[PDB]
Every structure is written in C-alpha cells, then in structure tokens.
Design a protein around this ligand. Sequence first.
Ligand SMILES: CCc1ccc(O)cc1
Ligand SMILES: CCc1ccc(O)cc1
Ligand SMILES: [Cl-]
Ligand SMILES: [Cl-]
Ligand SMILES: [Cl-]
Ligand SMILES: [Cl-]
Ligand SMILES: [Cl-]
Ligand SMILES: [Zn+2]
Ligand SMILES: [Zn+2]
Ligand SMILES: [Zn+2]
Lengths: 141, 142
Amino acid sequence: RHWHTVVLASSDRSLIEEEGPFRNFIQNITVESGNLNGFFLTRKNGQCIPLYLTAFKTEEARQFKLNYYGTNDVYYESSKPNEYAKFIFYNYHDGKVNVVANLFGRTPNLSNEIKKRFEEDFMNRGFRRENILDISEVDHC
Amino acid sequence: SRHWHTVVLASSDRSLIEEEGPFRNFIQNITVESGNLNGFFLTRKNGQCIPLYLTAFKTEEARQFKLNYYGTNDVYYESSKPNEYAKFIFYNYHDGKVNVVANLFGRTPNLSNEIKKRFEEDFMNRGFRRENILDISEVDHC
Ligand SMILES: CCc1ccc(O)cc1
Ligand SMILES: CCc1ccc(O)cc1
Ligand SMILES: [Cl-]
Ligand SMILES: [Cl-]
Ligand SMILES: [Cl-]
Ligand SMILES: [Cl-]
Ligand SMILES: [Cl-]
Ligand SMILES: [Zn+2]
Ligand SMILES: [Zn+2]
Ligand SMILES: [Zn+2]
C-alpha cells in the first residue's frame, strides 16, 4: 500500500504547481470493496495537511470515478504493478476538461527508463516538457 | 465490428460537434484488423457527404485506442450490450487543450430511450449542460 508521487504532468501546469488542486503527494492506497482509498498530503499555509479520497470502481476494469475539484474519470495502468503505478485523471471542472497524469513509485524515485517512458508518452500527446514536474528532486510533503 | 450509425454526439465543446465541426462525423462501419479499428465515416462539406477513413490503433490496454485526428486522441470503448450499441469516448488533445467527445452508436439509426437516457445522464453527471448533447437520430444527416 506504500506509495510515493514521483512525477506529475498536466495539460494545465497550474493544476500541479504550488497551491494547485492536483499537487498532492500520495502516501498509501488501500483497496476496499474494489474501491481505492487514497491517503495524500498537500501543502497549505506552510504545513502538510492530510487528504483522504476514494476512487470508486466502475463497470470497467482499471477505471474509477473520483469526486474532487469537480468530477474525474480515473484510469490505472502499469506494466510492473509492484514497481510503479500510473494514474491518469480526466478532470471536469466548470465545464473544462484537463488531464492529470501521476507516476507513483514504491520509493521516492523511479528508474530513468520508467520515468522516460511516462514523460515521452505524455509529450507525444501534444504537450510541452514544461508541463511535466519530476518531484523526486524536490523537498515536498 | 461492422454496420453502425451515429445516434448521439456529446462534447465539452459544442462547436466540435455542430455543423462544420471537426467531430461531426457519422459512422458507417467499423472493421477490425490486427486489433486496430478501421472506421469509415461521412462528413458534411459544402452540402456534400464526403468519406472519411480513420484508423484507431490498439494500445497495451484493452478497449483503449490511439487516433491521429484534429490533434491526438485517447479513445476508450465501452458497452454493456456490444451487439446493440457502442460507446466511444474521445479525449482529444488539440493545441495543448483537452476536450471530450462522446459518441453513441447503434446498429440502426436510433437507439432505445433507456440507452440514450443513460448515455446522456452520464455525460451531464460529469458537469456538462444538456445543450451539449446532440441526438442526431432526429435530424437528416449523411
Ligand atoms: C491516484 C489515484 C487515486 C485517487 C484517489 C484515491 O482515493 C486512491 C487512488
Ligand atoms: C468512433 C471510434 C472510432 C474511431 C476511429 C476509427 O478508425 C474507428 C472507430
Ligand atoms: Cl520508501
Ligand atoms: Cl517512506
Ligand atoms: Cl474553445
Ligand atoms: Cl439499419
Ligand atoms: Cl442502413
Ligand atoms: Zn517510502
Ligand atoms: Zn471551442
Ligand atoms: Zn443501417
């Protein structure tokens, strides 16, 4: 259940920048009744405050639904389930759609090969490198 | 995997599915080859129904495809009744902007009110207005 946020990427960089709604750092994930109960940390007023969310299962495997900053269609992917986890969030807020990609590792960092693939996959969709934030190299919660 | 009709279109940006919109295309058929989806659509251009052939390539994930059209697209297929209808959700990336276009296909020009109702409510439940849904089963199109 132990996880670390290693890379964040978004169509809207502000979503993952400081004070951003999706700049959350995963701590652990526990599966209950097929749902994903996530415990995250987020920074506010200088301190690390807990954030508990639940991504509910859907009729589709690896697809979940999450109510946060609007609604989100969440997709899980991983070729190495015990080494990393990739979660793609399609966020709908005020009629606006954005994609937020999360790369989780068992420890604070991940192999360059895994990070490179995640990053190139994001950029190949038509996004700039600047919209990728590798936080393994940052002092966060 | 064969004969289809576009019954309902819905999008985060209505201009995308309105007249002259890049996603206002009417499916005619889908042929599966090497796991890829070869689609044949019709599009209205200058009072003329012009053919549009596209291929959605398979990915490492089932029911997920990649399509190069009006930028890039992550395409997801869903259906509780595969022989009755097909739902395709397009996550379009155009000039750094993301939009969602949902397509509801039927074996014939129209679909049950139940199926259309669920499709439409699922769309609106995500935070979109009813006006962004276009039921084209009630309009003369290609
Ligand atoms: C990062 C994916 C996720 C979101 C919410 C949640 O509760 C658990 C996992
Ligand atoms: C509407 C889904 C679809 C897109 C492209 C394609 O080639 C086949 C099906
Ligand atoms: Cl660790
Ligand atoms: Cl630790
Ligand atoms: Cl626009
Ligand atoms: Cl028919
Ligand atoms: Cl027909
Ligand atoms: Zn750790
Ligand atoms: Zn527009
Ligand atoms: Zn027909």
